[PDB]
Design a protein that fits this description.
This protein is mostly helical. The chain has one domain (1-131): serine acetyltransferase, domain 1. It contains eight helices and no strands. The chain is globular. 24% of the residues are buried. Residues 1-131 form the PBS-linker domain. It is found in: Cellular thylakoid membrane.
């Protein structure tokens, strides 16, 4: 699914699809919906990537995958949700454990989202999907 201009139903589908990919489902509580960022995306004020980022940096993502998971599970889940793939091997897990230890939560999350690999596969306007 890609952005563009025709949207409306399309925008709606993009929004739900981002939730499904990044959080694992699109049936969240209303307190969990990032309605402000949804509005920006709909109004074309931010991109699909921006919206993916807002979801991954939200308290919803933090509580779902980060806080109550061992670090290596958090990392594996980052790979699956943000890049649409499992880590290639344990070296990727070691590398991001070091990244996290050194830069913190947001540095870790943004590493995937701003990555060349993300740009290459999804860019600014395609909803991430499992590859």
């Amino acid at each position: 699914e890609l952005r563009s201009r025709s949207t409306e139903e399309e925008v709606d589908a993009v929004i739900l699809a981002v939730y499904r990919q990044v959080l694992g489902n699109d049936h969240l509580m209303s307190q969990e919906r990032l309605t402000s960022a949804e509005s920006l995306l709909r109004g074309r004020e931010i991109s699909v990537r921006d919206f993916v980022r807002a979801v991954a940096l939200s308290e919803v993502y933090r509580q779902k995958f980060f806080h109550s998971n061992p670090q290596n599970r958090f990392i594996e889940l980052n790979y699956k949700h943000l890049l649409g793939r499992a880590p290639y091997d344990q070296s990727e897990i070691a590398f991001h454990t070091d990244l996290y230890h050194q830069g913190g939560y947001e540095a870790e999350i943004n590493s995937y989202i701003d990555s060349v690999e993300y740009t290459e596969n999804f860019g600014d306007w395609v909803v991430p999907y499992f590859r």
